[PDB]
Design a protein around this ligand. Structure first.
Ligand SMILES: Nc1ncnc2c1ncn2[C@@H]1O[C@H](CO)[C@@H](O)[C@H]1O
Length: 370
């Protein structure tokens, strides 16, 4: 039949996040379209190029699916050596343009900005109900382009909220440097708790499962704090504290790239995905229950909890801790974005990214746009 290699960056499955999303798209293609999928996880960064070269060399795969930005460097080198080997790069796009490479990029600014508004609002409500100061936050993985877009969008969204509302909610963003270190994710979060961070956006793959656990042990100590999921809806992991999730439809990327090949309509080039296409979004009722169903039938849903009970609890907390102004502002930005009235800039260098943040920290929001 048709044969696909899914080639992870760092972690592999068990994410609850980025890669498990990617596998889901591949798993759906195996069953619906009848293809053979092989997964594979390099044990080092050093070896990525050799491994990518050997799989192309093998002639066994109609498509090689590359899950993560870190594949961009090795692919730029390998792709031209095997021009009849088809590749899908997920969450990144190659510097040059090849016929044998379909890139799937997301516009993370779009969804993170919506999240920024929400977290600023939840932190505002925490402060208003408690009288103690509550910051927004994020525990991030590696310092790389997609996370630049998250960062920019998240800060944008917080400042937007602040300006539209006369609040001065602060935001603390920490790169941990790894996507596969839950323990480091937890210690990072525990430090942040003691610097007043109370709302925690997870932008670090597996790493921010530790973040989730840090916010649980805080809630257990009586402290009012909340987490925000990314990639999949992760509310099911602990719904009392995981109030919402930014969605990134990596599964649709992978599934679309595999379908295209199955129907001989593959073609090289960039495919950009944001709110307009369904590629990004926020976690709603059905999406929450869907992933909860998955974890239920996976036996990794926590004790004494069903998919239906998970939804009831999240909706309960969104009634309690997200004001209507939060939603009004979400909707007012979501619509300025879809309409084209707003479009973010994709930072070229690290130096450009760094100065967009200086400007957003200064309340100059227009720096992030065109
Ligand atoms: N294994 C990984 N390799 C590269 N990037 C990742 C990985 N896991 C997560 N990410 C990035 O971090 C974000 C937050 O989990 C994801 O949307 C993705 O952009």
């Amino acid at each position: 039949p048709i044969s696909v290699l899914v080639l992870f960056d760092v972690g592999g499955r068990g994410d609850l996040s980025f890669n498990d999303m990617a596998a889901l798209g591949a798993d759906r293609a195996a069953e619906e379209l009848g293809v053979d999928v092989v997964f594979q996880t390099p044990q080092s960064l050093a070896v990525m190029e050799s491994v990518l070269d050997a799989a192309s060399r093998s002639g066994e795969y109609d498509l090689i699916v590359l899950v993560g930005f870190l594949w961009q460097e090795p692919l730029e080198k390998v792709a031209p050596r095997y021009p009849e080997q088809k590749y899908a790069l997920i969450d990144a796009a190659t510097r040059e343009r090849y016929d044998n490479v379909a890139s799937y990029l997301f516009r993370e600014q779009e969804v993170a900005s919506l999240v920024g508004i929400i977290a600023a609002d939840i932190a505002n409500n925490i402060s208003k109900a408690t009288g103690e100061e509550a910051k927004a936050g994020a525990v991030a993985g590696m310092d790389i382009p997609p996370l630049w877009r998250f960062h920019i969008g998240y800060l944008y969204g917080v400042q937007y909220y602040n300006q539209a509302m006369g609040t001065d909610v602060e935001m603390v963003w920490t790169y941990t440097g790894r996507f596969d270190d839950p323990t480091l994710g937890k210690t990072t979060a525990e430090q942040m708790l003691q610097q007043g961070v109370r709302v925690f956006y997870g932008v670090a793959g597996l790493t921010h499962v530790g973040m989730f656990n840090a916010v649980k042990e805080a809630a257990a100590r009586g402290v009012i704090a909340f987490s925000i999921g990314q990639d999949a809806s992760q509310e099911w992991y602990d719904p009392q504290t995981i109030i919402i999730s930014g969605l990134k439809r990596v599964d649709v990327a992978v599934y679309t790239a595999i379908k295209d090949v199955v129907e001989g309509r593959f073609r090289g080039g960039i495919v950009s995905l944001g709110l307009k296409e369904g590629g990004l979004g926020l976690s709603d009722e059905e999406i929450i229950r869907y992933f909860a169903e998955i974890a239920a039938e996976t036996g990794q849903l926590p004790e004494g909890l069903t998919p239906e009970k998970v939804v009831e609890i999240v909706m309960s907390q969104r009634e309690k801790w997200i004001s209507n102004d939060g939603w009004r502002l979400v909707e007012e930005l979501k619509q300025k974005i879809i309409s084209g009235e707003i479009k973010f800039v994709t930072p070229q260098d690290h130096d450009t990214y760094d100065s967009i943040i200086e400007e957003l920290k200064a309340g100059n929001l227009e720096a992030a746009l065109e």
